[PDB]
Amino acid sequence: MWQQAIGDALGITARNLKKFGDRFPHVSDGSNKYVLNDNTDWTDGFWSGILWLCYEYTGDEQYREGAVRTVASFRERLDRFENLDHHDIGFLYSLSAKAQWIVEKDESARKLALDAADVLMRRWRADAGIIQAWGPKGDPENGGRIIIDCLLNLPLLLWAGEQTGDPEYRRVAEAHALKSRRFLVRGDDSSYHTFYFDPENGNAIRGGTHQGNTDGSTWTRGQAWGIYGFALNSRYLGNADLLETAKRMARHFLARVPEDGVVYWDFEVPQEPSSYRDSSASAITACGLLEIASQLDESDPERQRFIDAAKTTVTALRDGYAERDDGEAEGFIRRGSYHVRGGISPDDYTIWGDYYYLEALLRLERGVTGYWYERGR
């Protein structure tokens, strides 16, 4: 049921590793080819994650060697602080360095992830009680702004806290998660993409976005980050309120899934075929649904409901969006969208969409849960 889907991903990945060399895929732009970078964006970790997932599934050394090389690249990136003055250190290092520690207990990789967690900790703004998402400290524009995507960067901090025994990691992560719940999540279970606070006292100013259709709309990837994000923090914090929020956001998302089973880029624009989609949002949600289900009691009927919804989503992605390994295609799923309003790769491969699609497949087929937290823990 999932073997063929994984098989195509494995083949595409093997081909890509040989073609990309030491460079990293980010997104495609009008073709079946990825545009690469030299480990300078916020998405490089997803490539590492894909490599580790392929290794876990196959045991094929080619994937491990590729992943190990990306980890070496990440050490170099951290030690020269190249484009890391933002909150995405989690996406970057949880899926690469922490991932290697989770996969084979490599002490060097563990150290690198810990070093990265320290740099992320400096994104915390005590006066505002939030982790600053973008820009330098005190930035007039984004100095007191949080983004819902940040929930996925907290796992690195939480993991580090459990590794070191330093209570500050969890304190900072928990505060940010709770602040995100109160101000990013809406009363109808939808969500804002970003939220602004007064840098001086942390008081709420307003919610808004630059990637969703409007400040009051529902950017689907943003909603997806909430679903998986609140569920991941729920696990680490044993916080029932965050799990409840994950469930609420998931139900909201599920009720707005179109006919073919894959969402449009925003829930509040006409849900019409000529409109852009965001396969990555559906991929992220599939993982979030499975994560939520894993935290529910086996006697809870909604548990199997979410599991089945995740399966339906992955099948929808496979059937209508997945690329077959035709020796040319470089992405797993089509029609992801980076920045629709900005006209940036609105109908393309997204390395994060590819990563979550594969993580969902690995979860369903092997019970492999990715690299957000330790296994059997």
Swiss-Prot record:
<keyword id="KW-0119">Carbohydrate metabolism</keyword>
<dbReference type="GO" id="GO:0000272">
    <property type="term" value="P:polysaccharide catabolic process"/>
</dbReference>
<keyword id="KW-0963">Cytoplasm</keyword>
<dbReference type="Pfam" id="PF07470">
    <property type="entry name" value="Glyco_hydro_88"/>
</dbReference>
<feature type="active site" description="Proton donor">
    <location>
        <position position="149"/>
    </location>
</feature>
<dbReference type="InterPro" id="IPR052369">
    <property type="entry name" value="UG_Glycosaminoglycan_Hydrolase"/>
</dbReference>
<dbReference type="GO" id="GO:0005737">
    <property type="term" value="C:cytoplasm"/>
</dbReference>
<dbReference type="InterPro" id="IPR010905">
    <property type="entry name" value="Glyco_hydro_88"/>
</dbReference>
<keyword id="KW-0378">Hydrolase</keyword>
<keyword id="KW-0624">Polysaccharide degradation</keyword>
<dbReference type="InterPro" id="IPR012341">
    <property type="entry name" value="6hp_glycosidase-like_sf"/>
</dbReference>
<comment type="similarity">
    <text>Belongs to the glycosyl hydrolase 88 family.</text>
</comment>
<keyword id="KW-0326">Glycosidase</keyword>
<comment type="function">
    <text>Catalyzes the hydrolysis of oligosaccharides with unsaturated glucuronyl residues at the non-reducing terminal, to a sugar or an amino sugar, and an unsaturated D-glucuronic acid (GlcA), which is nonenzymatically converted immediately to alpha-keto acid.</text>
</comment>
<dbReference type="GO" id="GO:0052757">
    <property type="term" value="F:chondroitin hydrolase activity"/>
</dbReference>
<dbReference type="InterPro" id="IPR008928">
    <property type="entry name" value="6-hairpin_glycosidase_sf"/>
</dbReference>
<feature type="active site" description="Nucleophile">
    <location>
        <position position="88"/>
    </location>
</feature>
<protein>
    <recommendedName>
        <fullName>Unsaturated glucuronyl hydrolase</fullName>
        <ecNumber>3.2.1.179</ecNumber>
    </recommendedName>
</protein>
<comment type="subunit">
    <text>Monomer.</text>
</comment>
